[PDB]
Design a protein around this ligand. Structure first.
Ligand SMILES: *[C@@H]1O[C@H](CO)[C@@H](O[C@@H]2O[C@H](CO)[C@@H](O)[C@H](O)[C@H]2NC(C)=O)[C@H](O)[C@H]1NC(C)=O
Ligand SMILES: *[C@@H]1O[C@H](CO)[C@@H](O)[C@H](O)[C@H]1NC(C)=O
Lengths: 203, 110, 128
C-alpha cells in the first residue's frame, strides 16, 4: 500500500522543450511502477492510438522494458507515426517496424512553440539516398549530392543541406502548427519484469 | 504547341464505357516519362484524376481509369453521367522542352 | 485542406509587365513547391515556371526564359511571379499549383509527377 516506484513520466512529458524530429531522444524506463493514469491528466489529445495492447487495461498489463520517444511534428503529418505508413516523416526521420507494439500519444502545443516572428528550432530531414531500417536515427548532416558533379564538401547548385527547418508561427492554422508527439514502445522477453501496476489494496 | 494531340471531343451517351486518347512521341513520353490526367471545369480550377500512368488518387470513385501502351496512352470512364461534362487533359515531361500538355477534350453528353 | 488565394484581374497595355501572387492558406508552403501555368484563350495549357521555395532552386520554360521571374517566401509564403513584355498573345489566365510530394527523392526531380491542388486563376489582359 506504499507505492514508491512511480515511474518518472512527469519528466518525459512537460519537458518544456521537445527536441526536433531529425534527432529524437530515446529514454529507457524499467524497474519501477508505471501508473499510466497520470498520463491522462493533460490536454485533450489529437491522437491516442494503441496498437498492441488494449489501452484501458494499461495498469495491470506488465512489461520488461519500455521506451519513451518524443518529438515535434507538423500537424497534418501526425498520422504518419503509425506502423506501415509511408511518407516523409515516417521514411526519413522515424520508422516504426510493422510488428510494432506500444501506444502513441499526440497532443497540440500551438501556444508553446511559436513566436510572432517565427521559430526555426525544429529541423527535419528532407533528402537522403535511401529509407531507414526500423528504429534507427541519422543525426549526421552530409551535404546531399544530387547532380552528377560532387558538392566539394559544402552546399552548391543542386547540392543542399538535407535538413530543413520548420516555420512555426502563432498565426498558422490548425494542421500546420507543432503537435508534440510521444511514442511508448513495449517489449516482453525472459528478464525481470518488475513493470506492473500499483496494487489496489486496503490498509 | 508540340503537345499531346488527341481528338477534339466525343459526345456522351448515358451510362457507358468511353475511351479517350493521348498520342505523343517516344522521345517525350515513350522513353521513361509518365503521363498525367486532369479534369478541368471551364472557368474554375482543374482537378487531378490520374498520376504515374496507372495509379488512382483517393476521392475519385472507380468510374475513372486509364493506362498507357507503346507510344501513346489513354483514359476511360465507366458509367457516363452529365456531371462529367468537362474538359479533360493529359500532360507529361519533354526531353525536348520541359513539360508538355495536351489539347484537352470537351467531354459532352446529349 | 489547402487553398490558393490569388489576386484579381489585370488590365494593361502591350510591352508592359504584370506581377501576381499565389496566396496560400495558413501560410506554410512547407516544402510543397509551386508551378506557374498559363491558360491561353481558346487553347490548351502551357507550363511556364517552377519554384521549389525552401530550396530556392527555380526553373523556367525555354519559351519565356528571361521574360518571367518568380519569387516565394514559404513562411506565410505568397510566392510572386511577374511576366514582362505583355503583348496581344499574352492575354490569358494564370494558375498556380502544388506538387504534393515534399521530400528529396522526387522534389529535385519535381517537375515530373503531379500537381495536386490548384487555384481559381487570374485573368491578365492587354489593351488593344
Ligand atoms: C530524376 O530521376 C531520374 C531517374 O528517376 C534520374 O536520371 C537517371 O538516374 C539514374 C540513377 O542511377 C542515373 O544512373 C542516370 O544516369 C540518370 N539519367 C538517365 C538519363 O537515366 C535523374 O538524375 C533525376 N534528376 C535529378 C536532378 O536527380
Ligand atoms: C510542468 O512542471 C512545472 C513545474 O512543476 C509546472 O509548473 C507546470 O504546471 C507543469 N506543466 C503542466 C502542463 O502542468
Amino acid at each position: 500500500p506504499n507505492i514508491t516506484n512511480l515511474c518518472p513520466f512527469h519528466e518525459v512529458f512537460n519537458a518544456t522543450t521537445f527536441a526536433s524530429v531529425y534527432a529524437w531522444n530515446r529514454k529507457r524506463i524499467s524497474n519501477c511502477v508505471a501508473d499510466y493514469s497520470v498520463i491522462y491528466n493533460f490536454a485533450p489529445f489529437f491522437a491516442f492510438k494503441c496498437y498492441g495492447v488494449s489501452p484501458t487495461k494499461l495498469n495491470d498489463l506488465c512489461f520488461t522494458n519500455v521506451y519513451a520517444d518524443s518529438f515535434v511534428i507538423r500537424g497534418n503529418e501526425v498520422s504518419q507515426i503509425a506502423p506501415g505508413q509511408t511518407g516523409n516523416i515516417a521514411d526519413y526521420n522515424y520508422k516504426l517496424p510493422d510488428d510494432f507494439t506500444g501506444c502513441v500519444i499526440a497532443w497540440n502545443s500551438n501556444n508553446l512553440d511559436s513566436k510572432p516572428s517565427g521559430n526555426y528550432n525544429y529541423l527535419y530531414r528532407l533528402l537522403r539516398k535511401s529509407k531507414l531500417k526500423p528504429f534507427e536515427r541519422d543525426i549526421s548532416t552530409e551535404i546531399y549530392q544530387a547532380g552528377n558533379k560532387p558538392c566539394n564538401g559544402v552546399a552548391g547548385p543542386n547540392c543542399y543541406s538535407p535538413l530543413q527547418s520548420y516555420g512555426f508561427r502563432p498565426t498558422y492554422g490548425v494542421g500546420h502548427q507543432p503537435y508534440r508527439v510521444v511514442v511508448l514502445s513495449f517489449e516482453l522477453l525472459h528478464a525481470p519484469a518488475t513493470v506492473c501496476g500499483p496494487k489496489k489494496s486496503t490498509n | 504547341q508540340p503537345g499531346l494531340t488527341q481528338p477534339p471531343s466525343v459526345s456522351g451517351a448515358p451510362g457507358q464505357r468511353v475511351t479517350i486518347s493521348c498520342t505523343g512521341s517516344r522521345s517525350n513520353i515513350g522513353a521513361v516519362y509518365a503521363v498525367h490526367w486532369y479534369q478541368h471545369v471551364p472557368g474554375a480550377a482543374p482537378k487531378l484524376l490520374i498520376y504515374e500512368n496507372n495509379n488512382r488518387p483517393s476521392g475519385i470513385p472507380d468510374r475513372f481509369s486509364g493506362s498507357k501502351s507503346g507510344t501513346s496512352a489513354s483514359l476511360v470512364i465507366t458509367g457516363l453521367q452529365a456531371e462529367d461534362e468537362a474538359d479533360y487533359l493529359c500532360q507529361s515531361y519533354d526531353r525536348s522542352v520541359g513539360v508538355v500538355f495536351g489539347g484537352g477534350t470537351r467531354l459532352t453528353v446529349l | 485542406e489547402v487553398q490558393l488565394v490569388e489576386s484579381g484581374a489585370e488590365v494593361k497595355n502591350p510591352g508592359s509587365s504584370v506581377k501576381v501572387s499565389c496566396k496560400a492558406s495558413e501560410g506554410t508552403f512547407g516544402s510543397y513547391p509551386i508551378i506557374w501555368v498559363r491558360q491561353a484563350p481558346g487553347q490548351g495549357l502551357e507550363w511556364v515556371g517552377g519554384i521549389i521555395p525552401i530550396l530556392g532552386t527555380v526553373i523556367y520554360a525555354q519559351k519565356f526564359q528571361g521574360r518571367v521571374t518568380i519569387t516565394g517566401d514559404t513562411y506565410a509564403g505568397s510566392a510572386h511571379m511577374e511576366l514582362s513584355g505583355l503583348r496581344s498573345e499574352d492575354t490569358a489566365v494564370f494558375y498556380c499549383a502544388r506538387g504534393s510530394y515534399d521530400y528529396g527523392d522526387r522534389l529535385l526531380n519535381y517537375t515530373y509527377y503531379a500537381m495536386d491542388v490548384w487555384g481559381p486563376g487570374t485573368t491578365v489582359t492587354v489593351s488593344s
